[PDB]
Symmetry: C4
């Protein structure tokens, strides 16, 4: 079995999801604003046309055929409003047509047409911006419901599982992780919240990922990491939050998708280990998503990372 | 009290209106209004031209002669026909007849040109509000930056946040120092730029704007402030330029906002006041005290002198 | 001869101007056609049709509120829509109104408030459909990172000797010269490893240094370039040997991101290597042939033929022998 | 003095309009000529099929007979069909020629015409956006120094070259990287004729993100990691190397990014030279002399390369 060879790697769903999202969103937000923005200007132009009719007073000569009204077949407010909505939207049925005997009518038609073009351009731009975004969120790219600190290669390591559900919509990505918690400092300069970056491979470029399967991304706990002074017993009391952002993720189509999750002090487990999601066999591999979040307890020292390093130094010396 | 969601954090019409206002009517709207009007006027002129050439004007009320365009016997009539055809309304009171090939080709040209103009309209509306570098987007910076003691080391910190809602949480922050440096070789560079690290080595530049932070840069041996003292600062003429870029949660567009600090705006021995106050299950922000700063007790010696004193005390 | 690139142009003979009108039209046609063929058009057709059909059904229904088919013959009664009798009439009116045509043979009459609101909804829904449609067509073009078939990788990565160190190198190039430049490369290796604690990782990813520390991963690519990675302590290949290589069954992926000088867009290329495609103790054959005043590139023969002798043993053992002989 | 104190950002509308008009004066003929033919082809094809549907319907037998309802009212064979096609496709619909309900296939034909016209309008907008909103541009306002020099700076051998813009307000932030291209022969018998080696102009510390408010002298140090470590003054002419410099930045006026490129040869690198100061500060204001952007003046620097300089420094220290 080979990953791939000189290739990318080895569509009704997307359209259906987009249609469902649009249908869900259109009930409350879209139907109100997008309709009212046209309705207000159409009503405004209706009042303007009615005011011009009143100035010309063609209702008095509505039955009179000798008079030439500004707009043919104008009888009342509803007639003017209907003429306005006809003209502005570029329909022009013809039962009512502007005559050639009033320059004010020509000026109004020009203004209405250009303003309607502007409104349509605004409509298209707003629809494009709202529906299409350079970095849209993705329902895939689920994170592990737990982050586990475990024992790896002589050093403690915090890891969380991240992967893609569709097995093809994510190949390349990047990951960043920030711990937010409050300090006190030696000078008493209390800070209600502090952000510190936990290294996940920024120096070595390991932060970039080729996601072909679920990956257990492991942070390394060293003398330059926030968790360097925490232990098993001290973890529950201290309240800290971890925010993990995965970005720069193409979908083998071209756009960029983003995802974000977090972990709380009650959501971090000590001394556990992720259950492997992939099992190999002669000629084949099998991955079962049912064990994506499954974790099993393993033996590990309960001392702090600094305490573990001190114990190792004492034993070596 | 949590600052997360499983897929998000813990309106758009206003942003669109602000973008339209920034684009402004004078820059774009008036120009395209004029181009539309001149287009319609020119095509009305050519409609009069073809009507005169054919002679349709002479036989205004001749049933035998079928005109090129029905009921077109005046300049205002020709202008109405032009504006109706170009904008694709087609009332029908004025209709073309088949027996005029010149009218046919003119209609073809006018339709093509009108579609082109509409495409130009939309493309212009797909440029002024589609650039990937927006305005400041109300991402204010602290009017002052302070230098003081933290973690036992002298550091320079300035407050960064957004007075609007927490609708944007992503930022890369860079800070340059502009100063005139006299080289030991005698060369004088009047505008010298030196980058001060804010976490570039550790990747700490990519910060989370969940709340107004106090961005702090350590004053180490590499830092340009390695020789700046309390009395040295007033007589210097340095400058700091801070540029922060970030993408909003609404759309992938990125806004870039930057500010500057002159030597007057930098204070020695002060500290920012806290802006977040917590309570039993609820947190609050006093955005009034965003720029507030209170004096603290810090040594007046330079960072080099602090290091020398620490070395002497250790020795 | 040097690449003065004073106007961002490599000093190389170019024939891109010849048949440029044919070539650009052909590629913009093919790229647009390949995605849709009959996949976009069908969806467009069904959504427009079902919208129009829906409008027609509701127009027929509102006509079935005594507005017509009761006094159609009688001229005194004024229907909601002039000349609207059957379902076909309703469909033909909905298609005219929604498409912003409005011939006027069938036109709504002002004396029906229920029709004005219906037209109000129909016109705005049609405009929304059109705007969404233009956006859906547009998003195909706006996507960056378009696939590039012009970038090629060497079919055989090779480990060899370089300046006293073991180095793993492979050639990367562009099909035509002066098309892609300032490309960025990144190489990872996928391998199953077992920790000392008994933990098993069926798929472990490790980035191999190709210049990320020094920013050397951004290569100009004027000629087929032999991208090389030096084996050090941090290099995962530091433990493997000549005999271990056929038995490792490790895998390597390489990703290259560049910008096309013609349009300024972004392009991506991706390649893989297996333990069978990594030959030990070989070396690439040069593709450039310099001469007085001119260089010759035999790109038609990539010279993926290799030949070498001397390298053996491993990386760790070689270094150990090095400092043992040194001291 | 008081540089960028304001937080507003401290080329007119007429200039932008003139530039747009100049671009249009060349582009509009190209676009019209290349697209009108296929527009006419589409309309003529649809007019032909609108004629054929009537012909197979055979309504010409009752052209003068109003008793029999035709597919479309008041239609002639060769010309009027094309008129109806153009009146319908582009959403005009005068109404003098209107479809009738008596023919079923006319509805299908109209549906096809409308959907295809929508596709063509989408093509209009796509082509217009591609033509007017190209994502990359080659700005000519950024000029590199015609000469790069090597001199002394704080006891270190440093290679500098001058960069900057022309209108002083187009490019304000830009990243810079430089690669040396040289043929190298290894001790193992390898001969790579085109060896690329990046020279750090501040990539380690992020110093490459220049804030361009004035012509700036970019300086690259010489150390163990610098390829110029062994390059002596006498050795420099014989090296026949080459340097390529790339500078990408973001346009202040429009969020679109711009890129510039330049190169230097062994004959364009001078020993012991300094850029003359382009910008001089006076009382109350500064003055920038763009005429001295490329001007350089000789200065006294040691002729030995960096290695002998380091050896001499070590010997003096010892």
């Amino acid at each position: 079995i080979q990953r791939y060879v000189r290739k990318d790697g080895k569509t009704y769903r997307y359209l259906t999801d987009i249609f469902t999202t649009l249908v869900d969103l259109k009930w409350f937000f879209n139907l109100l604003i997008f309709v009212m923005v046209y309705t207000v200007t159409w009503l405004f132009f209706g009042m303007i046309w009615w005011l011009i009719a009143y100035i010309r007073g063609d209702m008095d000569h509505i039955e009179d055929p000798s008079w030439t009204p500004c707009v043919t077949n104008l009888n009342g407010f509803v007639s003017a409003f209907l003429f306005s909505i006809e003209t502005e939207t570029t329909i022009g049925y013809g039962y009512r047509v502007i005559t050639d005997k009033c320059p004010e009518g020509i000026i109004l038609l020009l203004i209405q047409s250009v303003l309607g073009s502007i409104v349509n351009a605004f409509m298209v731009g707003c629809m494009f911006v709202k529906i299409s975004q350079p970095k849209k969120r993705a329902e895939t790219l689920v994170f592990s419901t737990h982050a586990v600190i475990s024992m790896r290669d002589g050093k403690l390591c915090l890891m969380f599982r991240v992967g893609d559900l569709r097995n093809s919509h994510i190949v390349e990505a990047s990951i960043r992780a920030k711990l937010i918690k409050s300090k006190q400092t030696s000078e008493g300069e209390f800070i209600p919240l502090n952000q510190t970056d936990i290294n996940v491979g920024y120096y070595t470029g390991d932060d970039r990922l080729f996601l072909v399967s679920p990956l257990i991304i492991s942070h390394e706990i060293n003398q330059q990491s926030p968790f360097w002074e925490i232990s098993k017993a001290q973890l529950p009391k201290e309240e800290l939050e971890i925010v993990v952002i995965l970005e720069g993720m193409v979908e083998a189509t071209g756009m960029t998708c983003q995802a974000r999750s977090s972990y709380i002090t009650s959501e971090i487990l000590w001394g556990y280990r992720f259950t492997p999601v992939l099992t190999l066999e002669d000629g084949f591999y099998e991955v079962d998503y049912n064990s994506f979040h499954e974790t099993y307890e393993t033996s590990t020292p309960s001392l702090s990372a600094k305490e573990l390093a001190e114990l190792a130094n004492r034993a070596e010396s």
